[model samples]
Target: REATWVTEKPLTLKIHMHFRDKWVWDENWPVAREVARLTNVKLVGVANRAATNSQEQFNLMMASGQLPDIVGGDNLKDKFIRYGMEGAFIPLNKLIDQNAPNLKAFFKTHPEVQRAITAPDGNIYYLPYVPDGLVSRGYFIRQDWLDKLHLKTPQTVDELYTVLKAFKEKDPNGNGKADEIPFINRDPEEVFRLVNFWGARSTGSNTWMDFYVENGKIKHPFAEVAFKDGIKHVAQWYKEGLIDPEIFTRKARSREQTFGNNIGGMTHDWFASTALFNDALSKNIPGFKLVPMAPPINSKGQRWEEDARQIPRPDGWAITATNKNPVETIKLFDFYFGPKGRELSNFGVPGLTYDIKNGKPVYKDTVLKAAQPVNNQMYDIGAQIPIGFWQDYEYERQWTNDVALQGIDMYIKNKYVLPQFTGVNLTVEEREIYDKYWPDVKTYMFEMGQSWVMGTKDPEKTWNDYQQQLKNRGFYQVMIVMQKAYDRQY
Candidate 1:
């Protein structure tokens, strides 16, 4: 009914997901099926079970040279650069220029997105997921505990330490047992968010290689003097029983359950805890209070919150070279990229998910107050792509509840939202070499970090040894990749 999208004749194509996705393919479950009828473009989605990681399966797809109509995954820019160089994907220049006006306009409006994803070969192989609002990765402290202890919200690193120390010494939970966990995190990653105040600014990557731009040079935190001091401070917290005793080697989900049970004083997580905890925290704990706070200022007045990776986030949905109908595929996605498509994707069909309230698009309770927005039947009709969407600046205003919004407001008003620490570009060959060395080098840094803080291995010889091996293992050499990328942006 909307104009014929691709060919005058009907057409059907299959999408191969080399990585992972949750597309229900049943005709009754019309997520993809309904869109096919509306747009005259039908896609048959094939999911390959990942035996190990996505990389292993992708490598097989690469070697086998067998691909479906479309492939989507992380490192899509890298994938296109590496495999497209070897003819794994068709270059998208002509497709984007001719068929995807919506995508083109988006790039025109946001040039940084285009630059971030463009390969060294200068080809735009994939469209990255550019979230419209800031990603919500921040710290949440137990307001109830703060009140019980008669303490104000922690303002600086020292204040945070003092508050954590109070949580340890005082019975904030009103339980006689010495069972309060002052700070319990899933891993050291979130803990490092606080270390940014000490000027370390380490990241949350499991791989342990993260960058913090220092003096216009892309510097890894492990090599910085501030990083050493940061470790000493965190280790001291552990020594003083301010942090959880088992954080160094706790079982996964052990401390997470501790927070849900309402014994921990503070935490760091994204939206899930706020959503899941609020309904339960009140029901479970009497006079329970939880609130997300702006990250406390560091020693030097810097407040660092790990920002969501800026636009064209390395990977998003992309059309594969295998698509016989690249023109139709591009046009199909273009339908969702513009205003009309964006509305449909975000709000769902009229009267169901949203309705006209005073001539403006106001979300009905179906979306605004759904127990889980992801489960709305609108998803069954291929309406919203949460992962790959351009949310308006105030998109959260429509869906977020009051308590959570309060936390987010405090988070945004935080004095110093640190600049996103980004990485550099590398050739596939260079990536291969760096990948080999990064693990051991990362282990050395973290091991030394833990040892120095716990007072296990003092930073005398091991500190110098750690630096020596990192340099010898090509820390500086690998920075060559990032330095060039930084120069291009600055």
Candidate 2:
């Protein structure tokens, strides 16, 4: 691996990557510089100000036929497959076979992951950001509020309702004003996420309009009869003012505003960031403790955590067909799968961001207690961004406290998390049908679902009509395409 990394000559490659901070590849950054120093491969980012979003910028790059040596972003795997099929990217099979022993050994052990990355046409086009585990998010509640009110952790939908109602009326925050938003969320669309509490499952992505596997068949959850029951429960909660009244207008800062002010009681969100509220808010609100809790069981006596992530999430990079040094480029990335490279990618530069302590890599105090959140700071240093390397959750565990780890294990032990479909590709014909009808169909579902929860549209009488409207909008046609694509994955 050392011989592979220390090349005879230094190499430079151009990459277009997406980060919320719009971070262009800078060699000065610790992660980037460490990789460069270790492997002699310098990554230069291709930036275009014309398009502000990742997919837009990527599409513009694709249309221009002047792609960077590597093109990458989160949730771009499906598009990568499409473009690769269209001859925009070179197949990595021959390159990996000849030059990537580390990655080849990985594929040998992880056959499913290998299959997931392979296209239907039998070409390997990209290296994925593999994760150590699948549990990504969970239901979190203010443990201090429950302690103050002497209420037990909620076990069923009815119990959850009681807790939210108390948080709304009893002033759990102890503020004189009755302004607690008992169950606050970041966005309006997240209201649909409530459907999971009623035994309705969501696909890997948040779009309930997309297809899900139920008993080995592809079906849209929105069109199901049980979906209405879930909607009705949310409508009732909204009527009782248990949910945020201004949820439709809420932005990302709403979590900071509500949690910082001690006005939010509960939320179902990412465990890592949500658990940090305890550290972030304990000084402002004494005895503040946000803890993860089991998801409430529905009336049918089933508890399902639907947001478990798909393995090797749909993000990574592909080498474009225009790349001249395809063999050297593949070998350069292959170095990351080796021990030396994986360690540096997961934990930053040794003796700077992280260090070896008793045979394990641990973050330095500077990183663990940075002014900004640990994850944010890590992203800034380029340690945890969605890149082509396998992600070690142990890196996350270093920043996480015991409380969050306890909850993560509880979910795994109970077997409540459902595994998601790895990766399902659509054929050219199916993609044509999907692109024609999906956007309009998706918009209608979101708007209508939001209206139902807000009482603007009654789910009782209009539910059947809504289903008919979806049918009229080519929902069945899209389902057919989804089924065909899903069948091909098997």
| Each prediction's whole-model lDDT (CA) | 0.66, 0.80
Counted clashes in each candidate structure: 1, 0
Per-residue CA lDDT of candidate 1, range 1-490, in tens?
5563556667787664443344423333343544566678877656464344655655676677577776665545576567766676767778889988888898798876777666666776666666655656567788888888899988888889889888888888787877788887776655545567686767623224477676887778778777777777777777887777767676468434776666788776664345456666676788776677777778877777765535445655666667788888888777767775566666556665677677556777656656665434555555444334454544446766677777666666653355565455566766876687777777777777767767797665467777788889877777776677667644
Residue 374 shift from truth in candidate 1, angstroms: 1.9
Clashing pairs in 2: none
RMSD, candidate 2, Å: 3.2
Q: Quote the positional error of residue 111 for candidate 1 in Å.
A: 2.0
Predict model 1's lDDT versus the native.
Answer: 0.66
- Model 2 per-residue lDDT at 372: 85
TM-score for all predictions?
Answer: 0.86, 0.87
| Residue pairs with backbone overlap in model 1 | 197-298
